[PDB]
Design a protein around this ligand. Sequence first.
Ligand SMILES: Nc1ncnc2c1ncn2[C@@H]1O[C@H](COP(=O)(O)OP(=O)(O)O)[C@@H](O)[C@H]1O
Ligand SMILES: Nc1ncnc2c1ncn2[C@@H]1O[C@H](COP(=O)(O)OP(=O)(O)O)[C@@H](O)[C@H]1O
Ligand SMILES: Nc1ncnc2c1ncn2[C@@H]1O[C@H](COP(=O)(O)OP(=O)(O)O)[C@@H](O)[C@H]1O
Lengths: 85, 85, 436, 436, 218
Amino acid sequence: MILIDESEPTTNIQIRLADGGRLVQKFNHSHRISDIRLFIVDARPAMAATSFILMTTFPNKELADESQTLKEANLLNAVIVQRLT
Amino acid sequence: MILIDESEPTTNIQIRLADGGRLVQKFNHSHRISDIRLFIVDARPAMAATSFILMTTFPNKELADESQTLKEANLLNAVIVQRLT
Amino acid sequence: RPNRLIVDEAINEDNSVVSLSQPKMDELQLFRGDTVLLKGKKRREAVCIVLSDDTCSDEKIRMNRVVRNNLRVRLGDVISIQPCPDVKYGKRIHVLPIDDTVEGITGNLFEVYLKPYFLEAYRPIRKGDIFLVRGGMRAVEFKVVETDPSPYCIVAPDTVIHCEGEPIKREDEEESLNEVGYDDIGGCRKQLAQIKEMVELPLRHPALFKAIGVKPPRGILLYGPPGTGKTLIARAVANETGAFFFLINGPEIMSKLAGESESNLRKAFEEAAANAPAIIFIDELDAIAPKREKTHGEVERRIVSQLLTLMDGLKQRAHVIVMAATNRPNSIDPALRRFGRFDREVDIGIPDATGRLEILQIHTKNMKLADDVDLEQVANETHGHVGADLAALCSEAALQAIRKKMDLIDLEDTIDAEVMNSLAVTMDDFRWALSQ
Amino acid sequence: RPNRLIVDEAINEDNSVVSLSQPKMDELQLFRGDTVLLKGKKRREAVCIVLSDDTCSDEKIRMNRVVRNNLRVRLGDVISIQPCPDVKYGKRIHVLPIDDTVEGITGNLFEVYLKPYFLEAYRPIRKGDIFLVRGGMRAVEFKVVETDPSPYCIVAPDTVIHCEGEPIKREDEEESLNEVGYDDIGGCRKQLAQIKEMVELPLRHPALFKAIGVKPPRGILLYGPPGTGKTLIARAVANETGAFFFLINGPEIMSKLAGESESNLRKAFEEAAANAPAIIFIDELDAIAPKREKTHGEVERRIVSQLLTLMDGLKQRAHVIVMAATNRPNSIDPALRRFGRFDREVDIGIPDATGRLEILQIHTKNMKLADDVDLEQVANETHGHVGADLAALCSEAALQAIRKKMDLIDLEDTIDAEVMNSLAVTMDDFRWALSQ
Amino acid sequence: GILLYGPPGTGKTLIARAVANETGAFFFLINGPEIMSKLAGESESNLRKAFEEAAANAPAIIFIDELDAIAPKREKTHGEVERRIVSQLLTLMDGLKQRAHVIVMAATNRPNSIDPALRRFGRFDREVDIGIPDATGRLEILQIHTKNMKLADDVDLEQVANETHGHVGADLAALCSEAALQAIRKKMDLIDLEDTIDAEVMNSLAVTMDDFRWALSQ
Ligand SMILES: Nc1ncnc2c1ncn2[C@@H]1O[C@H](COP(=O)(O)OP(=O)(O)O)[C@@H](O)[C@H]1O
Ligand SMILES: Nc1ncnc2c1ncn2[C@@H]1O[C@H](COP(=O)(O)OP(=O)(O)O)[C@@H](O)[C@H]1O
Ligand SMILES: Nc1ncnc2c1ncn2[C@@H]1O[C@H](COP(=O)(O)OP(=O)(O)O)[C@@H](O)[C@H]1O
């Protein structure tokens, strides 16, 4: 469902889901943050409807511009936290 | 005669030939310095036999380990000088 | 062998965060923002958030004292790190304040400390952790008594945070965070670094000086004007290295009867040597051993002699370092600056504008500052000022804040020893203080 | 435009190399080691090798004075750069020495200077270039009279280099490289930078102070111990900024009859003002205007008064800056530090160990050093030393080298005023000098 | 009586101790400050006990370290018990004839720092100047203080000799000590990590010229 070009630089992302300490982990690369969102919906269909945002911690930063690339948003090898809204 | 993966990072190399102010310029990428040699022989068939070495100037540095990559040998976007031997 | 790192000073002031080099995290396969499990001495563990630091050595980990305490380790010790992938959002945690940090605090602990501290921060905690929360011009310590997913979890927005009354006693090995550390010293980077070098081997590896016959420094003379933080440095170096600290106050010694002075000097060195590795700090050395001519007494000259003797009577001496503070080199007797004595000097100068800023942050850590408060500006208008001046400034600012609110409070009755958490010190308070 | 850059000081000591920022070369599409064509003032061009420099501003190009001279420009001016893809290995070049640089030199010129200078270096040259070759404790200038592929080429191993007879005369606009420049000053980075700021607008953009009513500095007081290079700095700043330079030597003035002193001060300021923009340098200010009490004469007091008057008599002054050197601030009359006068002070201190090294390289540029010569070592054993000491050291070292060879030379006859090029100064020469 | 003069750290104590050991004589140290630190009366009692014990165990050397602490220039004393101590010293020395064969050595910074009555005729009548060491001396001292260290091959003591002109023996010993401790610190991070041999591996450790440079610029 997520397509990874094996010849491009790649990275892992760890998602902390609100819904319990659900820890999902996934290879991405020059994907957008919006790709993390679709991966999340893909892995937890129930969230398709639910309203949530993605952020990093320490400090809290809301990933507001989902069109940015993991590289641009400095999210290589990062933990992304799902916050309900 | 030289193959460039256009999906990979790329660079241009200017080769100053000893055989007169021969200025050859060619694209490469993660090619070895030995690929510059191959390209030189390819472009000047007459030199298949002739004995020569490749170096940078200021300071003079002989590129002795031809197995190194343009990136490793810090030769991105460099002028390489052919010195007869 | 790759997961073992050397403990180093924090740059990130958040007690939850430890820092690794970019390369090291690569090597260990740790996510930026990951929860990590630290293993220390005495079978202690801590859970923390890991972040990268560009200036951190590849073999070092940066952590705040809070975490060093929890792991029962000190700067230069060795811990092990490992990812914590199983860590769950906690259902409920139970915390209690340490008694000695909450005397006089008549507030709502949850509403005033815990709620803001944990709110949306995603802090990991482990049972038996002591953490620190600042606020209301005080800093309270709490112990984690229970976590629902035991023994560690993340305090998520849905985690129920319980106190449930009755401050607890401080155990023996649990050092107060109110103790002086390098964290409480601003604007001495260079000198603090020298002193740390001098003292490292003698205080942290004392067994060495039984194995070899090289002489470490014995006496260090800290020089500079009053209020520059010489006492602070000595106290901090002791605490951080886990050495015993013995204070000798010049005036206190000189206040004694002829003979009880000399007896007090002796008892100081004896007690030090008994509890080594140890630091003896002699505050106001010039009170005891002034310029050879400035003494007029005969018992006065006996005291100085007694001090020289005591210095000479220190070999490795179970590993005792003597530190002493004075205004200027030439204020004291040139014989203490002899060889087997105060043969090392360090100048604690007036702080610069950067230093002034560090000091101002140190002395405001527990205050609520309004958004209009600059600090870098206060730094710039205080050129002559030394640490003690800046601390007084913050103190005067805060007391002015309190007076302004005191008429208002007396009228609609007198919450008094409480609303000090809602109170904020404003730039207007600092200006008031800056012109006094 | 992107091809326009601001001229800046060289880091790379090789006269053929100019430096750009990494980003700028990217932008301009220039190869590392490419031959580039520089365009200056007065329709002058230069050809150089371009290299990247990490510390170079994106809008600046770093070049040595040699190339600045060839382009008739000064630090801060604007040049244009462009690649030179057509440049050919030259068949033959013709060079001649400038007369004033070769007085006394009775050598081969080709074998001693040109051959080693060009050998396997691939230097680009342009007709009408003056270049500099160092050696034999001299530095000789040559003019390029003809290049076979005209007007520029690369001197390749097969390029025939002609220098057939008859040193040429120096044209008017051709400044000698024997003139003092910033490249002759070591270990003053910080202070030299301040002085350059102060002087930039008044000396390089004088028309400004006719367009506005803001006051530039008038008087700059350089202080520090003898031999620290204060005269050197003032001379250099003048040369580099193209300003007129007028020296007033304290002792020289005071050596004159009462009245011929005051007449000489006056003539100095008049001549400066006449030739502005100009720098007046007052060497040994304390000889002329000592502490108000230290004067005992009556003509002495008249001279200091005359100096104050002359300072005050400098309004917009066209654009005249007065620089003066003294040992200490307190050695001179405080009325000189009044506002309209010497209101700017700069401390030229003792150099550190890095500075000492720069000075040692500066004073060895024209010597042949053996491989065993470690300047960093000589740096480390010369802690007290100031520039003038280090220059004397190199001079003593070189003269010792020469004495060692002098017995050998007298015997198998006396080449004498030659063979000084084959001679090499050895670490043993420096040790000898270091203990004298 | 032999009076050894020279700046602190020149090895006056060392000389006296060595002469005792080498000649097989009994050695008794009297430290100026130690004596002056005592109660009025316990000073004079301590001087007496020193000469008695020397004479009892002769042939013997009594070394008086920091003589100027006990017997300073006649005017520099202000006390009355202070003047009694100096007198007590004159008495004891003049009371040593050929004695049981007891020689008295004392160290001080300068001739003029002490009471001229001590440079008397039956007392400190021989003076010997222990000056600042030269470059050759500096080298001997550096070898003495390195005898038990492993030096790397790149260590040039003659070099360290040459950059330490002002230095006295005590300075050079501190230099070697600082060099060695730096060697140890450099290796201490490495050792803590791959566990802490600690009070060992100090034999495989070598002090390098880089260690001395570090020390020479401190
Ligand atoms: N460098 C400093 N950093 C932080 N606080 C300082 C500093 N210098 C002084 N202070 C503050 O002022 C107080 C007085 O300093 P103290 O240790 O008594 O210094 P000193 O012994 O030089 O007088 C300190 O306890 C501290 O609160
Ligand atoms: N910073 C320096 N860099 C290079 N050479 C120096 C430096 N300082 C001094 N010298 C050398 O020593 C000489 C003495 O310096 P001088 O200009 O007379 O200084 P001052 O005017 O302070 O006495 C100079 O002419 C120069 O050759
Ligand atoms: N000439 C020397 N040779 C060797 N070590 C010396 C010498 N001079 C001084 N030292 C060192 O300095 C230390 C302190 O000197 P010390 O014996 O107290 O001399 P002084 O009594 O003149 O101060 C000595 O124990 C020794 O380690």
